[PDB]
Each structure stands twice: as C-alpha cells, then as structure tokens.
Amino acid sequence: GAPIHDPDFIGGIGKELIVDNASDVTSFYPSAFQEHLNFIPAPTTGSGCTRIPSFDMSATHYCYTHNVILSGCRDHSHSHQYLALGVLRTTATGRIFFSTLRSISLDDTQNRKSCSVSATPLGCDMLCSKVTETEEEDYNSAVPTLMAHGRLGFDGQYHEKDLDVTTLFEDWVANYPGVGGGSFIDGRVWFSVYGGLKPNSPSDTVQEGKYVIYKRYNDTCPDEQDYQIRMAKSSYKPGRFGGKRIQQAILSIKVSTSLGEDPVLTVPPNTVTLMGAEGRILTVGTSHFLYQRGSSYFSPALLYPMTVSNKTATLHSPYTFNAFTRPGSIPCQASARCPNSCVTGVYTDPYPLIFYRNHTLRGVFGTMLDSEQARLNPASAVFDSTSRSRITRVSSSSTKAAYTTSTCFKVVKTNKTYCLSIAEISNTLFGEFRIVPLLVEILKNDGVR
Amino acid sequence: GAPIHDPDFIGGIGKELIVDNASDVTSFYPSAFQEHLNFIPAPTTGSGCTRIPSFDMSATHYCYTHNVILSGCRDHSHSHQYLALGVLRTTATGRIFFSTLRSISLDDTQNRKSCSVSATPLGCDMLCSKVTETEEEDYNSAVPTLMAHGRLGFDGQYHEKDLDVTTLFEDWVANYPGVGGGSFIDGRVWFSVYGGLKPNSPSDTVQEGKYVIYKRYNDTCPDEQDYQIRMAKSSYKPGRFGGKRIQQAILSIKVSTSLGEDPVLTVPPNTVTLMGAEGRILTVGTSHFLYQRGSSYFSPALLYPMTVSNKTATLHSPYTFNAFTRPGSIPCQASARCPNSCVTGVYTDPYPLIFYRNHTLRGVFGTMLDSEQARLNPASAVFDSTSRSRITRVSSSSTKAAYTTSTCFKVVKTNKTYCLSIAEISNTLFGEFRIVPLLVEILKND
Ligand SMILES: *[C@@H]1O[C@H](CO)[C@@H](O[C@@H]2O[C@H](CO)[C@@H](O)[C@H](O)[C@H]2NC(C)=O)[C@H](O)[C@H]1NC(C)=O
Ligand SMILES: *[C@@H]1O[C@H](CO)[C@@H](O[C@@H]2O[C@H](CO)[C@@H](O)[C@H](O)[C@H]2NC(C)=O)[C@H](O)[C@H]1NC(C)=O
Ligand SMILES: *[C@@H]1O[C@H](CO)[C@@H](O)[C@H](O)[C@H]1NC(C)=O
Ligand SMILES: [Ca+2]
C-alpha cells in the first residue's frame, strides 16, 4: 500500500542498467514475454479503443496515461483521458506487477488529445492539447492550439490549468504534446512538443535555411548533394500541411502547487532536429534524451542528447540505431536512406539500456514495428548503432501497431533487468486498437565466449 | 410479416447450393475472407465476451443470438442474451451485408443459457435454458432444467413462455438447447436438445444397451469387437456426470402467436445417435439434418439425415466427413478411431453445400478447429466424406475458438455461392472470446 516502489526496485529505477564495455551490445536480448501485466485498463467498451499511451517512471513511482474512445477509433471522435499513478511491486514469489495508487478518467467535455505524462515528486504531470477541430484544419487555423497542464496527485486529486498559448505559442498555428513521456528535471517538467510555425513569424524566420542530413550506416544516398539538401529543406515543410514548417520543440514548466506555472518554450535549431514529430523526454541516470518519432525521411530511432540550462534546453547530435527502423510510406520506408519530404512513420521509442563506463549510450531496448511500410509486426529487441539482437515478436505478423513506449528497470534485489513495453495493438478481426503492457527480461548469452 | 432480404437473394436461401455429380467435391474451396461483416455486436465491455453463437436463416430473414458477459468470460457469471432479427442485403457495389432490423438485449435476472435461435415465419424463435446452478450441480439435481421458448418478432417485441419442463423433460435431470440453430419445418420449430436422463426413467429404460459405433474411413479400430461394444456403450454414460446417460433429443414446438405451444420431445434411439451433445437442426432444400457436436469419441463432423412426421423426428445413419475433424482431449482427440468414454470436442457445424443430382449430400463447408487436442486454429474449408479442400485459416495457429457455425447462401444475381462462418474466437493480447462473422465465396478449380 506504500506510495512508492517496493524495496526490491529501490535503486533500480531510472539509472544506467548495464555498462558492459567488452561484450557486444546485441548479445543482450529480450526473453519470452513474461508476466503479462494488467495495470492498463482495457477499452471501456468492446467496440471502442484505448490509444496514445504515455508512460514515465521516477525512482518512487510511475505515471501512465491513455486516450479512450467509446465507439470506433477514429480521431474525429469524442474521447476520455485515463490518467494513473502507480508503483512497481513484487508478490511473495517475486512476481513483478504494476500497482496503481491512484487513477482518474477525465470523463468531462474537454477534448484532450496527444497527451503526455511525467512522474514528478508531486505526482503525475500531464500535458494535453484541447481542440474541437481537425488536425489538418489546426495547421490551417490562424491561432495556436490550446494546451493544458494537469496533475493527478498522490492524494488522488486532479488539477488542471489551461496555458496562455496565445503568447506561449504565438508563433504556432498548430502545437501538440509529443505523446511520449515527459521528464522531471531541476524542479521543472519537460515535455517534447511539435507543430506548425506561423509563416514569417520570429520562430519561423529563425529556422529559415536550417536543416540537417542524417545518413544511414553502410548505405549512402545515391542522390546528388544539390538534390539531397533540396529534399532535406523541404522535409520541414511537407505538402500535407501546406508549406507550414513542422517544428520540433521542448516545453519546460515549473512543478509546483500552481499548474502551468512559468512555461518556457525552447525551439532547438533545425540544424540539429529533423521535422517536428511526436517525441519523448526521458532521463536515464544523469543524461537526458529527446526521442523523436521518425515522421520524416529518417527511419532509424533518434535519441537526441538533451542538456538543461535553467528553464531552456539544448539538443545535440542524436544517437542513431540503424536496425531500430520504423515502417513508413515511400520514399520514407523503413529502408529509406535519402532525405525527402513526408509525414509518415510510427512512434516507437528506444529506452537507453546499455552504456559505456564513460556513460556514452551504447545500446537500447524498444518494440519496433518490423515492417517496411505498413504499421505492423511489433518486435522487442536490443539495438546498438547498427544491429539488433534476437527479437521477441509481440504477436503475429498481422498485428497492427500505432505506438510502443518502452521503459526498462532493474530489480536490484535479484539484479535482473526488465523492460516494460506498452503497445497500442490490434488484430484484423478482434476489434479496434487497445493498449497492452508487456514485460520482458533482458538476457545475455555467456556461453557464447 | 416477412421483411424480405433483397431481390438478389430469392431462390438462393436455404437451397442446395452446388449440384454436381462429376466435379471432385474438394475441387470447390473457400477464398479469402471477402469482408468482416458488422451485424454482430462486439462485447458491450472491453473486458467481457460474446459467446455461444446461434444462427438460422429462412427465405426472408436471418436470426442471430449470442450470450454476453460484462466482466471476463467465466461461464459461471451473470449474463444477458442478445437476440437479433435481420435481413441479407447488398449495396450498389454488390457488396453483401447483413442488416439487423430488430434486436433485443434480455438483461433481466434470469440466467438464459445455451440458447438456440430459429428463423420462423413469425420472427426469431429462441429456445433457452434458465439455470441457477452449475453444469454438474444440474446433473446431480432431481428436477429437469428450466427452458423457455421466446420470440423476437418483426415488430421488435420479444415474448417468452417458460416450458413445462416438469412434464416435458420429466425423464431428465439436466437439459439444454443444442446452441446451434433450430429449423422451421411443417408449421413447427425444431431444436436439437441434450442433457442427462434420470436413471431408470422410461426414457432411460428405452435406451438401456442401445449404442452405435461409427468408424473412420480408412482407419479401422484394432480393438476387439467386445471391447469396442463395451466402450461404445460406456460412451453414453461418461464419468463427467456420474453415470447419467447424456442423451441427444429433438424438441419441436408449434409456431404460433402462443409461445411454447404443443411441445413434443423426441428422443432418437441410441442405435443411431452418439452421446448427447450440442447440435443444430438444418434444412437445406427439402432435406433436413441434425448436426451433433463430437463431444464423444467420434471426431469427423456428423450430419444425421432428419425426416419429420407429425411433431416427431427420425434420425438416420449420418453423413460423416473424415477430414472435418475437431480437437478433443485424449483419448477422444481429433485422430481418434475407437469407441471411448469422454466429454470433449467443440461445436463446429458443417453446412450442406454440394449435392448429387438425386439430392444425396456429398460436400459441406465449415470452419473446423485445425488441431489435435487444443481448441485452436480455426480454418474454413469445403469437405466431402474423406477430404478437405484448400483452406482459409481465420487467424493465427494459436487463435482460440469455442464455436463456429456456418450458413451458406447464394447471390442469384451474380450466381456466386457464399458462406457465413460465425466464430467465437480469442487471441493472446486482445482480450476474451468474441464472436466474429466471416464471409467467404466458394470457388472451384474449374
Ligand atoms: C567512451 O569510450 C568510447 C570508446 O569505444 C568512445 O567511442 C569512440 O568515440 C570517438 C569520438 O567520440 C569516435 O571517433 C570513435 O569511433 C568511438 N569508438 C567507438 C568504438 O565507439 C566514446 O566517445 C567515449 N565516450 C565518452 C563520453 O568519452
Ligand atoms: C445418388 O447417387 C449416388 C452416386 O452413385 C449414390 O451413391 C452410391 O450408392 C450406391 C448404392 O447402390 C453405392 O455404390 C454407394 O453408396 C454410392 N456409390 C458411389 C460410386 O458413390 C446415392 O445412393 C444416390 N442417391 C439415391 C437417393 O439413390
Ligand atoms: C482407402 O483404403 C484403400 C485400401 O483399403 C485404398 O485403396 C484407398 O486408396 C484409400 N483411400 C484413401 C482416401 O486413403
Ligand atoms: Ca437439474
């Protein structure tokens, strides 16, 4: 009943789990899907769905949230936001299970979507967007998207406060939380956000001519330099949103009794970040990372090192995992190696797992959609910069996936490393999407050498 | 007040679909699942299930029913019965779809169980059992199981009349409908029924020593005759129910504005029928058939010819489809070839599809559970006495399945034969059982 992770987890949450410098990264791999957890509620109705999962865990508790739709799973539909606060416990037999301390289903009328959540000392901080219109209409609207900062405390109470997006996102036509989890850092909660810049606005003007071309390993692009640059520049203004610059941002907010207190929007230079996309701000040990969904031409998982300076942050050259690809429409498929304009891909974050003694991230765990173009075939595995380990297929090759957010930890008591993988999956004839939690232990083959 | 399907279906409902004497039966086969029909409601909750499906279709309308559990799918939970009256339609594109005209969700305090539905001229007749105890607690009791004859009319109203089981099933300790659809024949609705007989009751006495042994095609049981005969006899009184003879029966009720009118329970001789099990009363063309779930030692799909005469039925030696097996626990697994005593298997009916010119049945469509012992891997196909055509697996090999009921019809316009396969299935991460309708066209290597 303790409002903290059970003693066995103490000291095994949020840190660098494995630091092997000698042994290969891919030698570490996911086992068979263990103790199928049930902290995530199934959809309220049989014809409805659960979608857009966000999870973040600190050394004391975890936070989880998801959007629920009563009929169908089409975005242009009414939805409720489910938010929960919980801790990692063990049974008498050592069985790991996610225990919910508090939970709330926002059954009101506010149209919350693209919500992200973060574990803070005060509980579970949530960043949501509120809109009654279309997404493609939002980038077509003149005003920024409404956003709110909420919190489900340890006391079960929920408080929320709408942000003054008029001034905070004055340079944006559309703005949304990255859906991925946010991170608590130096008294502030950091949520990755994305959207469209108002053309010719101060923010849009500062990003003019700014771009970056990330290459694939051992697979260079055959297109000429002049053309690649031309394509990279256009990747920030995909035709889908009519020329608007799809921008990546970072929003920090002070964690205190007052919600939405002192919000500061940092917009990293596009010479670092690719096209704005869904993302996640996480902290593993002492380093911070910004996961960016590969919505543009870049297929391999991006893990941007994030450093903090007061209320703003700076992103450095991203860690890339070539094998950890994501499905996408041509010319931005899983094998795409050339810069291009597109709004595709799927959110499938990599959790910093293996590090060097010097703390440089060496390997990550994540449930990728092992598919070339279609959002399907989820598979858990460990990936370094170029390869992947023995995979643990979530289900069949027919399983459609929309999101996979992974968070790994250790049971210091048994010294075993585990990875929680929350996936929004569905089969062709079993119903709409539903979020399912999968826990897998990270193994290592010693008898190899 | 027949609502009528679509002019495209006239002459193509409940008829002999494919009449051929030359073409190899297995040359006919199911295509890919054309579409995923929407007439069947998903479980009301995401943590519950839809189970025990029943379906019957007549010239002008179809009837469908399933049981719904709000939390989980424990057969020992409170539930409500969903009943629907519908029609076979077709969009401008020519896309087949089942339109549900009327539907009611019986959510009272009664425990309807093992319901069977039938499309009658007055609507959708449902035969349910009303229980207050478990399967075993029921067979141990002295009194028969309560049953009710109900009906969803074209007007949307549902009327129900509990049958006088005390007299109707006086010789029974437990009795339930076969779950499979019932059929309208000669002014009355016919429902397969099964349960356990009261020891020494007249019905039981008449069955003493009666048994029948059905062999596999080219898989002769090596057991000595005396041993087989003893096993066959014992198969009727499996240990599961402490020696109570599990009997197959047939209930016919007069179809009229008065429910439960003139009930007549027929109990076929166990020299014809194997141990009582879930079943269905089908009518294809002028012929009638009784499908009996292979709950005993017999694995191949069974279709007993059924002839009716003044309120009573008569079953004959059944058509068997050797490759249309079903999974079962040992020693009555799908590969079984010898008589034995057991209560296993799963409901997976064969729909009469291909007939000889003379009307003798030869081929059927069905969605079998392509497994040996576990209720997994549903797979649709066309079957004859010894073979299986090319298949269309419904899902993965680890897909669970509790029931599959198929009904084939024909679009007279495009003259294409289709088969509705309604299956209660589940999968690993996607929750409890759920009834899903599947539609496949019947094709041929010619
Ligand atoms: C930690 O040690 C590794 C040694 O493998 C360093 O990796 C090298 O880093 C240099 C420059 O960053 C690269 O040019 C080499 O290609 C890397 N070699 C390998 C095998 O990765 C890493 O930079 C060190 N990290 C820190 C923070 O000192
Ligand atoms: C319809 O035709 C079939 C085809 O012959 C008949 O089935 C045959 O019946 C004879 C009985 O003399 C046996 O050789 C076999 O049972 C069948 N033979 C073959 C080659 O299949 C069937 O009996 C006919 N139906 C009726 C009602 O007469
Ligand atoms: C059945 O067995 C006989 C031998 O008794 C054989 O000639 C025939 O080909 C077999 N048929 C099949 C389908 O195996
Ligand atoms: Ca009883």
Side-chain angles (χ1 to χ4, degrees), chain B residues 141-153:
Chain B
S141 192
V143 304
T145 312
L146 175 57
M147 300 185 98
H149 182 190
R151 182 183 300 129
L152 201 200

mmCIF file of all heavy atoms in Angstrom, chain B residues 141-153:
data_model
loop_
_atom_site.group_PDB
_atom_site.id
_atom_site.type_symbol
_atom_site.label_atom_id
_atom_site.label_comp_id
_atom_site.label_asym_id
_atom_site.label_seq_id
_atom_site.Cartn_x
_atom_site.Cartn_y
_atom_site.Cartn_z
ATOM 1 N N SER B 141 -28.998 -32.808 -9.578
ATOM 2 C CA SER B 141 -30.326 -32.443 -9.110
ATOM 3 C C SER B 141 -31.397 -33.409 -9.613
ATOM 4 O O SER B 141 -31.206 -34.106 -10.611
ATOM 5 C CB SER B 141 -30.652 -31.013 -9.542
ATOM 6 O OG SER B 141 -31.804 -30.532 -8.877
ATOM 7 N N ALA B 142 -32.517 -33.452 -8.902
ATOM 8 C CA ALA B 142 -33.620 -34.332 -9.260
ATOM 9 C C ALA B 142 -34.516 -33.736 -10.351
ATOM 10 O O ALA B 142 -35.023 -34.458 -11.208
ATOM 11 C CB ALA B 142 -34.446 -34.654 -8.021
ATOM 12 N N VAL B 143 -34.675 -32.417 -10.326
ATOM 13 C CA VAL B 143 -35.523 -31.710 -11.282
ATOM 14 C C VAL B 143 -34.856 -31.348 -12.617
ATOM 15 O O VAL B 143 -33.662 -31.073 -12.673
ATOM 16 C CB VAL B 143 -36.064 -30.417 -10.652
ATOM 17 C CG1 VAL B 143 -36.809 -30.730 -9.361
ATOM 18 C CG2 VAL B 143 -34.923 -29.450 -10.389
ATOM 19 N N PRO B 144 -35.637 -31.336 -13.711
ATOM 20 C CA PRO B 144 -35.158 -31.003 -15.062
ATOM 21 C C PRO B 144 -34.746 -29.526 -15.132
ATOM 22 O O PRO B 144 -35.116 -28.729 -14.271
ATOM 23 C CB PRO B 144 -36.390 -31.248 -15.930
ATOM 24 C CG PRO B 144 -37.187 -32.262 -15.145
ATOM 25 C CD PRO B 144 -37.046 -31.768 -13.742
ATOM 26 N N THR B 145 -33.966 -29.160 -16.143
ATOM 27 C CA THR B 145 -33.531 -27.775 -16.287
ATOM 28 C C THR B 145 -34.688 -26.947 -16.840
ATOM 29 O O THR B 145 -35.456 -27.439 -17.671
ATOM 30 C CB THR B 145 -32.352 -27.666 -17.277
ATOM 31 O OG1 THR B 145 -31.357 -28.642 -16.953
ATOM 32 C CG2 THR B 145 -31.732 -26.282 -17.233
ATOM 33 N N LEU B 146 -34.827 -25.706 -16.374
ATOM 34 C CA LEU B 146 -35.892 -24.841 -16.886
ATOM 35 C C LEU B 146 -35.536 -24.358 -18.287
ATOM 36 O O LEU B 146 -34.373 -24.056 -18.580
ATOM 37 C CB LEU B 146 -36.151 -23.631 -15.978
ATOM 38 C CG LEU B 146 -37.185 -22.633 -16.551
ATOM 39 C CD1 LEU B 146 -38.532 -23.333 -16.839
ATOM 40 C CD2 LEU B 146 -37.386 -21.445 -15.606
ATOM 41 N N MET B 147 -36.537 -24.336 -19.160
ATOM 42 C CA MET B 147 -36.341 -23.886 -20.525
ATOM 43 C C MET B 147 -37.437 -22.919 -20.926
ATOM 44 O O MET B 147 -38.549 -22.962 -20.389
ATOM 45 C CB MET B 147 -36.319 -25.065 -21.495
ATOM 46 C CG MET B 147 -35.217 -26.071 -21.219
ATOM 47 S SD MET B 147 -35.207 -27.324 -22.484
ATOM 48 C CE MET B 147 -33.920 -26.726 -23.545
ATOM 49 N N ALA B 148 -37.122 -22.053 -21.881
ATOM 50 C CA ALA B 148 -38.080 -21.077 -22.347
ATOM 51 C C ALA B 148 -38.085 -20.924 -23.857
ATOM 52 O O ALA B 148 -37.035 -20.958 -24.512
ATOM 53 C CB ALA B 148 -37.815 -19.743 -21.693
ATOM 54 N N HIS B 149 -39.293 -20.818 -24.402
ATOM 55 C CA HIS B 149 -39.491 -20.604 -25.823
ATOM 56 C C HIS B 149 -39.816 -19.123 -25.950
ATOM 57 O O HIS B 149 -40.788 -18.635 -25.366
ATOM 58 C CB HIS B 149 -40.658 -21.440 -26.340
ATOM 59 C CG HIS B 149 -40.898 -21.299 -27.810
ATOM 60 N ND1 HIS B 149 -42.013 -21.815 -28.431
ATOM 61 C CD2 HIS B 149 -40.171 -20.699 -28.781
ATOM 62 C CE1 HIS B 149 -41.966 -21.537 -29.721
ATOM 63 N NE2 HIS B 149 -40.859 -20.860 -29.961
ATOM 64 N N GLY B 150 -38.974 -18.405 -26.682
ATOM 65 C CA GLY B 150 -39.180 -16.982 -26.857
ATOM 66 C C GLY B 150 -39.185 -16.566 -28.307
ATOM 67 O O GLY B 150 -38.861 -17.366 -29.196
ATOM 68 N N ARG B 151 -39.548 -15.312 -28.559
ATOM 69 C CA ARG B 151 -39.579 -14.826 -29.934
ATOM 70 C C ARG B 151 -39.465 -13.322 -30.107
ATOM 71 O O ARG B 151 -40.128 -12.546 -29.421
ATOM 72 C CB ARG B 151 -40.838 -15.310 -30.652
ATOM 73 C CG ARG B 151 -40.896 -14.874 -32.106
ATOM 74 C CD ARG B 151 -42.185 -15.297 -32.776
ATOM 75 N NE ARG B 151 -42.368 -16.744 -32.781
ATOM 76 C CZ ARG B 151 -43.465 -17.362 -32.357
ATOM 77 N NH1 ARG B 151 -44.492 -16.660 -31.885
ATOM 78 N NH2 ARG B 151 -43.533 -18.687 -32.407
ATOM 79 N N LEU B 152 -38.561 -12.926 -30.995
ATOM 80 C CA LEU B 152 -38.373 -11.534 -31.332
ATOM 81 C C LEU B 152 -39.145 -11.462 -32.646
ATOM 82 O O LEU B 152 -38.821 -12.180 -33.594
ATOM 83 C CB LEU B 152 -36.899 -11.224 -31.604
ATOM 84 C CG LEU B 152 -36.427 -9.763 -31.488
ATOM 85 C CD1 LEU B 152 -35.127 -9.572 -32.255
ATOM 86 C CD2 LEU B 152 -37.470 -8.792 -32.009
ATOM 87 N N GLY B 153 -40.209 -10.666 -32.670
ATOM 88 C CA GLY B 153 -40.992 -10.526 -33.884
ATOM 89 C C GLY B 153 -40.440 -9.441 -34.793
ATOM 90 O O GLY B 153 -39.509 -8.714 -34.422
#
